[PDB]
Design a binder for these strands. Sequence first.
RNA 1: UCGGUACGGUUUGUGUAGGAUAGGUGGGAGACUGUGAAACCUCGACGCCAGUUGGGGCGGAGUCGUUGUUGAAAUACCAC
RNA 2: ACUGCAGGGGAGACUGGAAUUCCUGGUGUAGCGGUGGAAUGCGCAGAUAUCAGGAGGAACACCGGUGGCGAAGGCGGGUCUCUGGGCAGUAACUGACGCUGAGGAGCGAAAGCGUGGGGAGCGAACAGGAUUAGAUACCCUGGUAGUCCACGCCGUAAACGGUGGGUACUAGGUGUGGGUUUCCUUCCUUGGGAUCCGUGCCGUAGCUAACGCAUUAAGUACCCCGCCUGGGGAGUACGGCCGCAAGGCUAAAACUCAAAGGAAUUGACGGGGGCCCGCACAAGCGGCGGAGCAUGUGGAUUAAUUCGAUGCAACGCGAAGAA
RNA 3: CGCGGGGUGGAGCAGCCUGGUAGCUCGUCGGGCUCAUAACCCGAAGGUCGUCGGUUCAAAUCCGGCCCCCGCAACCA
RNA 4: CGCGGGGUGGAGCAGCCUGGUAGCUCGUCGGGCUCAUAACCCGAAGGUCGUCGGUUCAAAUCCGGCCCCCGCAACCA
RNA 5: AACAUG
Lengths: 155, 117
Amino acid sequence: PRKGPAPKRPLVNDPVYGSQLVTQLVNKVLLKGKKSLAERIVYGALEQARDKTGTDPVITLKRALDNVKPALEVRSRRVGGATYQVPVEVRPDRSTTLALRWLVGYSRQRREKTMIERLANEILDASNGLGASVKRREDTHKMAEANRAFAHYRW
Amino acid sequence: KKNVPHGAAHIKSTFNNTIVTITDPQGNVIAWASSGHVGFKGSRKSTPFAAQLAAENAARKAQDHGVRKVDVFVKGPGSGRETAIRSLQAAGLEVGAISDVTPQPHNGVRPPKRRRV
RNA sequence: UCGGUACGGUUUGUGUAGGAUAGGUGGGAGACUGUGAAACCUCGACGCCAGUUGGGGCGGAGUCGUUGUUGAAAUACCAC
RNA sequence: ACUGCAGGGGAGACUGGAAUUCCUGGUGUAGCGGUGGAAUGCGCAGAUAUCAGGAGGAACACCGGUGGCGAAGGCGGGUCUCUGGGCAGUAACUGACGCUGAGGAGCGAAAGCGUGGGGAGCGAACAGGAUUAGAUACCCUGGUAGUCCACGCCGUAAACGGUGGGUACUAGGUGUGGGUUUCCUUCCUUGGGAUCCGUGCCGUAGCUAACGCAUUAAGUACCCCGCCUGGGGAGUACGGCCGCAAGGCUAAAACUCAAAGGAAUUGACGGGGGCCCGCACAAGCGGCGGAGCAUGUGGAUUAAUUCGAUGCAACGCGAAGAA
RNA sequence: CGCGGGGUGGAGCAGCCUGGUAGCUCGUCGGGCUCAUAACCCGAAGGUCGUCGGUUCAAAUCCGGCCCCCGCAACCA
RNA sequence: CGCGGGGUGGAGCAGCCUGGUAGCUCGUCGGGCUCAUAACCCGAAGGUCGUCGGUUCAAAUCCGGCCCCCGCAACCA
RNA sequence: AACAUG
Ligand SMILES: [Mg+2]
Ligand SMILES: [Mg+2]
Ligand SMILES: [Mg+2]
Ligand SMILES: [Mg+2]
Ligand SMILES: [Mg+2]
Ligand SMILES: [Mg+2]
Ligand SMILES: [Mg+2]
Ligand SMILES: [Mg+2]
Ligand SMILES: [Mg+2]
Ligand SMILES: [Mg+2]
Ligand SMILES: [Mg+2]
Ligand SMILES: [Mg+2]
Ligand SMILES: [Mg+2]
Ligand SMILES: [Mg+2]
Ligand SMILES: [Mg+2]
Ligand SMILES: [Mg+2]
Ligand SMILES: [Mg+2]
Ligand SMILES: [Mg+2]
Ligand SMILES: [Mg+2]
Ligand SMILES: [Mg+2]
Ligand SMILES: [Mg+2]
Ligand SMILES: [Mg+2]
Ligand SMILES: [Mg+2]
Ligand SMILES: [Mg+2]
Ligand SMILES: [Mg+2]
Ligand SMILES: [Mg+2]
Ligand SMILES: [Mg+2]
Ligand SMILES: [Mg+2]
Ligand SMILES: [Mg+2]
Ligand SMILES: [Mg+2]
Ligand SMILES: [Mg+2]
Ligand SMILES: [Mg+2]
Ligand SMILES: [Mg+2]
């Protein structure tokens, strides 16, 4: 806005898994106001995550996010008759947002049948550094680390 | 296959490019790796990041000839001029005295016409 | 001053597996210390992980492959 | 006339250092150059870079300014030689010897012309590259005349302070350039005062259509000269004069228009400036444009397809109900 | 006929002498940014390394036979 | 009249001695963008390959006939 | 870069 920053909304702790990271995942899965539907998908995929490791699922979730959080994004800027990308530093609570969007997004177009086994397989493949969500992490990094020459115009 | 302990590091820095040559105190070139030598083409050569990659590439190639300390003679109206001096330090050299040797005519030759850009 | 040629000495050699024994072939357990052993020093030689090292400086008697790989297996050591 | 004083005033000769380019040699390896972004181009046959030597040309960093000098154009590296003007003081001398000046004459930036030199860099023309609908341009890479010198021709410029010369008067304030002279003159302070000649800023009376000018007048006055008489046609034609030429000077009319102008005013606008806001962009989430149907509209058709709406701000609008 | 090299991803070319990986460049596809994939950026497809055999544990590399081009020097009555 | 080129979408050009696919550019049409038009952008459509008549299973391509267009020749008394 | 017109 013209008049400075807006207050951001607090997320209440998730009752089944006592963490605000789970309730920040259910709002990315949420479509059309189906929040009790969106929580059955997230809870159901996290129960399937411990059925393939035995480990606690939110520890697997935080290992899955740490492999897909970007550190450098590649925002665009025009100067004269040419454009380029400036590598800028991702503030941390944007990197939480931008990584939860990649896990939900790249697993909606994944090859399984239901959304529970699509979301759970993307979490397990990201907590090992294998999935397509991990692939966009280094594609975001290789794009931004190919443009260090333009890191001197940071607004 | 040489050994020269103290040398001189000449830095030319224009609005288009930067050339970082390292010589002996008699003016014999030891290594010279510039900004287009490291992979850069067009207007990316004049950026300060392209300057500090050239200053590393000439420094660590001069240390293969046993150079441990350089004197710095900079010239030219470029912004890759102080990112090069702070890249010879952070490559294993001791930079010594810094001099500006930019040529200054005493109302000498006629410059080209001004650009109606 | 830069080679070519005939011949001698010196030296070179690192997929993976794995002695670090790291070119082919031969057979080779005795060649191995006043020809003064090993440790220890480091004027150096090279570079791909540990130098295989022509450093010749220091020693006061092994610098053994049957085990446990490079087809695999020696490659200490000797002819080529 | 004498006595001083300041000065890029001018002409001639000699001469200095920096930088650019080229040449020769060394070191050196693969790029350099250029732009908004590139490409043409240069280079890999040893470029650019770098160090030493050499050749040549042109312009003179700092001083340097708002400052100085010159009738104007103009004038700044150094030294020497020849030379022009100005200011102040003394009041020694001459005794109105003054001012202006039609015609005329001389000087007169830059471009250009002739002959002869010289040519580093720059750079019309030209050539390639780019940009674009095109690009005979702007931007890039090259590049001839010319820019320099000697001697002549040209005689034009927004040659401007858009303000002809001479003279006398008419409040001051305030910087700065050159002198002269006064009280504690050293009160070191090179300070204040007076006065003469410049060159700036402000400002009174007065003037002006207004903007503005204002002791350096565009004020108040006198002398002489140049010029104007609506806008175009036109500073053109024809005639003459000058010129090697380009062209310069002198200079009309037919015809056509009822305006063309100057200053200021309010607005609107700007690919002007400052500040500021808005789902304007960004950051997000879900769409439309493709399918089938519904509804309105354009066009077409029909005997009639009733009329109205037509960029945002008409089009599931008037129509909250056409068998 | 002798000699003297060469065939490798859609095009180009290293690796070959000296045996253990098939790579680089351009073209293409896809994505990104953008007025313009002009450029710039990332990922991938595209290969019995001319074909047969042969030698070695193992051959793009080395041997031989074959097709297929390019040179040179002849031969050309 | 000789010789040798040519006729392909609305325009200008490819494709043909290499018989089995008809191509590029501008233009026309439909949609964007704009207050509107140019420029720009997306999507399409359009050709008996001059006529005829052979050859062939098959002809723009091969071979003859005509009808047009273009160029070079037409000299010695 | 960029951009004509009424
Ligand atoms: Mg003088
Ligand atoms: Mg010099
Ligand atoms: Mg020269
Ligand atoms: Mg040079
Ligand atoms: Mg002088
Ligand atoms: Mg008398
Ligand atoms: Mg007179
Ligand atoms: Mg007169
Ligand atoms: Mg004259
Ligand atoms: Mg002149
Ligand atoms: Mg001349
Ligand atoms: Mg001449
Ligand atoms: Mg041109
Ligand atoms: Mg030019
Ligand atoms: Mg001429
Ligand atoms: Mg003269
Ligand atoms: Mg003037
Ligand atoms: Mg006048
Ligand atoms: Mg007067
Ligand atoms: Mg005065
Ligand atoms: Mg005033
Ligand atoms: Mg007046
Ligand atoms: Mg008139
Ligand atoms: Mg005239
Ligand atoms: Mg006349
Ligand atoms: Mg006006
Ligand atoms: Mg405005
Ligand atoms: Mg709002
Ligand atoms: Mg947005
Ligand atoms: Mg639809
Ligand atoms: Mg109607
Ligand atoms: Mg409505
Ligand atoms: Mg259309």
